[PDB]
Amino acid sequence: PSRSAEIMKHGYPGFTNVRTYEDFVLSYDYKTRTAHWVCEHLTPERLVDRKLCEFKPDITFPQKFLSQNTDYKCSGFDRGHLAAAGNHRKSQLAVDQTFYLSNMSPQVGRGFNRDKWNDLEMHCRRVAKKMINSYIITGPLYLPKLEGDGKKYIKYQVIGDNNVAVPTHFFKVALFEVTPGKFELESYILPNAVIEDTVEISKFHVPLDAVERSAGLEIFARLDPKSIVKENGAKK
Amino acid sequence: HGSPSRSAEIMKHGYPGFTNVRTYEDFVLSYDYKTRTAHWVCEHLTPERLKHAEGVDRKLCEFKPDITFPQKFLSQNTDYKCSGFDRGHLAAAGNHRKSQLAVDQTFYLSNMSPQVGRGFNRDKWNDLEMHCRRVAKKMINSYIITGPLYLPKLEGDGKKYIKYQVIGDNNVAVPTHFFKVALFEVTPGKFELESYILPNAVIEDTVEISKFHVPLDAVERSAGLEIFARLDPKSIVKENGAK
Ligand SMILES: [Mg+2]
Ligand SMILES: [Mg+2]
């Protein structure tokens, strides 16, 4: 209601099958059976037993477009939450909802979901605690690669009876309000793959344009570019 | 006086989705920023609308981007040029015969998908389009929803993959298949439904279009869309020629 406007202050990346939860906002893709994007707003103050949580479908979407635990089970992938449970520990209801399958994408486990991707999540929280407001957009990507015939193909696995898409990569875009009305921007794209623990997350910095162009989204479109005072660690 | 406004008339039986919608003069389109082609298009035909207004000429139309979408999500003629694929119109030029503007707009790249030419766009796919017009000439109203599909195949590792080429600087998706669903009003409030999925591939000319019938549910699951979702089932008197 008013919370959703707080979360979405800087713009909707898109308007497709939008659902507003207690403490995050999500756009769902009926074709991939995972999200287009999720948006979160963090503050030091906003940053309960996670063990009570249950992976389950959000049944406010049509049945024919749901993913299920059986799709992820024995798939070789984790149920990887886009809006991290660790970002929503203010109430049991908030964290419970991060375990909805609409907020999950199939993720490589060891080496990614459990490690380097988690490192990135921890980074955003660490910085968010020193900031006024923070906004995080997170979502899957399906990126082309050149093949042996010299042509470009998008190729991605689908898992389970419901053919849930396994993204090739994920994006995360963080906006940190360092001083009132002034923001630091950080944009990342990481492969859905085993990543060495030694790889610093800055190696995955990309221009925001890359995220937008690849995802088909318009990110922080309400925000005046002149209010961005730092971008991927570089002063502006 | 009460004759409906055009977009309302076209969309009488519901929007399959609401993403990046463009209402053109004589068809409605939902555009996919990720694939740089449509999610779906919807058209409404009647026998009268299939009577050509003399002087309207497809020869005067130009393929061109609809520049009202953000630049970074546009396709261009150069994406298709030398790609190995035709610019295949989802809402067919031949369905829009009553004004030059109306047919001009079918040549917007938003309404184009990369299609195999010989044996598909120019042949079996066109056979399906012609079939729909032939049937529409005998119905009170006809509604057609058309769109691209990206469908999985089982590979040798025992895993399923969706794989499709992307073409040009803008990485326009080449759909694996296309769907078409036609709703034919045969008597007031009663409808015949026809649903098809064809591969974006060379198809033998001798193959009957009816070989590509699928249940509507199949199209919906594949496309991630809710198609003719407001229809009472009792209003449907025939499905894929049956009943
Ligand atoms: Mg996780
Ligand atoms: Mg054609």
Domain total of chain B: 1
Say how far apart CA A94 and CA A21 lie, in whole Å: 8
Compute the half-sphere exposure of residue B21: CA atoms within 13 Å on the CB side of its CA. Answer: 13
CB contact under 8 A, A155 and B163: yes
**CATH number reported for the structural domain that contains residue B15 in this entry:** 3.40.570.10
Residue in the structure block whose two tokens are 């895993």? B159
- Which residue does chain B place closest to A36, by CA atoms? B34
Amino acid identity of residue B18, one-letter, is F
Name B58's Cβ contacts closer than 8 Å, sequence gap at least 6.
B93, B103
Say how far apart CA A31 and CA B224 lie, in whole Å: 4
Say how far apart CA A72 and CA B166 lie, in whole Å: 28
Give the Å distances, CA to CA, from B215 to A6, B12, B175, B180, B240.
43, 22, 20, 11, 8
Q: Which helix (H) or strand (E) holds B107?
A: none
Say how far apart CA A120 and CA A123 lie, in whole Å: 5
Which of B70, B164, B221 is facing A64, going by the closest CB pair?
A: B221
Tell me the DSSP string of chain A: -HHHHHHTTT--S--TTEEE-SS-EEEEETTTTEEEEEEEEE-TTT---GGG---B--TTS-GGG---HHHHTTTT-EEEESS-GGG--S-HHHHHHTTBGGGEEEE-IIIIITTHHHHHHHHHHHHHTTSS-EEEEEEEE--EEE-TTS-EEEEEEEETTTTEE--SEEEEEEEEEEETTEEEEEEEEEESS---TT--GGGGB--HHHHHHHHT--TTTTS-GGGEEEETTEE-
CB atoms within 10 A of CB A15: 11
**Residues B48-65 as b or e (16 or more Cβ within 10 Å = b):** ebbeeeeebeeeebeeeb
Q: Which helix (H) or strand (E) holds B206?
A: none
Which of B70, B217, B224 is facing A31, going by the closest CB pair?
A: B224
Nearest CA of chain A to the CA of B31: how many Å?
A: 11
Nearest Cα to Cα of residue A165 among B125, B163, B179: B163
Q: Annotated catalytic, A205?
A: no
Neighbours of ion ligand 2 (CB under 5 A): B 88-89, 121
Give the Å distances, CA to CA, from A230 to A126, A174, A204, A233.
17, 12, 17, 6
Method for this entry: X-ray
- What is the arrangement of strands in the sheet containing B21-23, beginning at the earlier edge strand? B21-23, B28-32, B37-45, B141-149, B177-187, B190-199, B236-239
Structure tokens at B151: 């469908």
Say how far apart CA B187 and CA B164 lie, in whole Å: 41
Chains A & B: contacts with CB separation below 8 Å: 68
- Which residue does chain A place closest to B220, by CA atoms? A64
Distance B211 CA to ligand 2 centre (A): 20
Which of B34, B166, B220 is facing A153, going by the closest CB pair?
A: B166
Compute the half-sphere exposure of residue B33: CA atoms within 13 Å on the CB side of its CA. Answer: 24
Print the domain residue range for B185.
1-243
Nearest Cα to Cα of residue A96 among A61, A50, A139, A63: A50
Structure tokens at B240: 């894929």
Name the maximum alpha-carbon separation found in chain A: 54
CB B92 within 8 A of CB B178: no
Nearest CA of chain B to the CA of A79: how many Å?
A: 18
Say how far apart CA B130 and CA B146 lie, in whole Å: 14
Query: 3-state class of B88 per DSSP?
Result: strand
CB atoms within 10 A of CB A100: 23
Inter-residue long-range contacts of B205-208, CB under 8 Å, 24+ positions, other chains counted = B205/B119, B205/B123, B205/B124, B207/B124
Query: 3-state class of B156 per DSSP?
Result: coil
| DSSP H helices in chain B | 6-10, 77-80, 100-104, 124-136, 216-223
Compute the half-sphere exposure of residue A167: CA atoms within 13 Å on the CB side of its CA. Answer: 30
Structure tokens at A223: 């925000």
Read off φ and ψ for residue A3, nearest 5 degrees: -65, -40
Nearest Cα to Cα of residue A221 among A2, A12, A7: A12
Say how far apart CA A165 and CA B114 lie, in whole Å: 23
CB A19 within 8 A of CB A51: no
Name B41's Cβ contacts closer than 8 Å, sequence gap at least 6.
B27, B28, B29, B30, B90, B91, B111, B145, B146, B147
Instruction: Tell me the resolution in Å.
Output: 1.8
CB contact under 8 A, B173 and A159: no
Cα torsion at B108, B112, B118, B119 (round to 10°)? -140
- B235: alpha, beta or left, given left = phi > 0 and alpha = psi -120 to 50? alpha
Name B185's Cβ contacts closer than 8 Å, sequence gap at least 6.
B139, B140, B141, B142, B191
Say how far apart CA A129 and CA A23 lie, in whole Å: 17
Structure tokens at B227: 């198609």
Distance B123 CA to ligand 2 centre (A): 9
Q: Is the sign of the CA dihedral B75, B79, B80, B84 positive or negative?
A: negative
| Rg (chain A; Cα; Å) | 17
Check A36, A81, A88, A169 and give the catalytic one. Answer: A81
Say how far apart CA A34 and CA A19 lie, in whole Å: 13
Distance B29 CA to ligand 1 centre (A): 36
Nearest CA of chain B to the CA of A168: how many Å?
A: 11
Nearest Cα to Cα of residue B182 among B223, B221, B220, B228: B228
Say how far apart CA A93 and CA A48 lie, in whole Å: 9
CB A8 within 8 A of CB A25: yes
CB A98 within 8 A of CB A24: yes
Best of B162, B169, B230 to mutate (most A CBs within 10 Å, chain A)? B162
Give the Å distances, CA to CA, from A188 to A191, A205, B206.
10, 5, 51
CB B207 within 8 A of CB B199: no
- Which residue does chain B place closest to A63, by CA atoms? B221
CB A130 within 8 A of CB A174: no
Say how far apart CA B88 and CA B37 lie, in whole Å: 10
Nearest Cα to Cα of residue A164 among A101, A86, A84: A101
Question: Which residues sit opposite B153 in a β-bridge?
Answer: B161
Neighbour-count burial of B211, counting CB atoms closer than 10 A to its CB (0-12 exposed, 13-18 middle, 19+ buried): exposed
Give the Å distances, CA to CA, from A22 to A40, A87, A93, A143, B236.
11, 12, 7, 32, 41
> Degrees (nearest 5) of the Cα angle B77, B86, B98?
85
Cα torsion at B3, B7, B13, B15 (round to 10°)? -160
What residue numbers of B does the annotated binding site for Mg(2+) cover?
A: 121
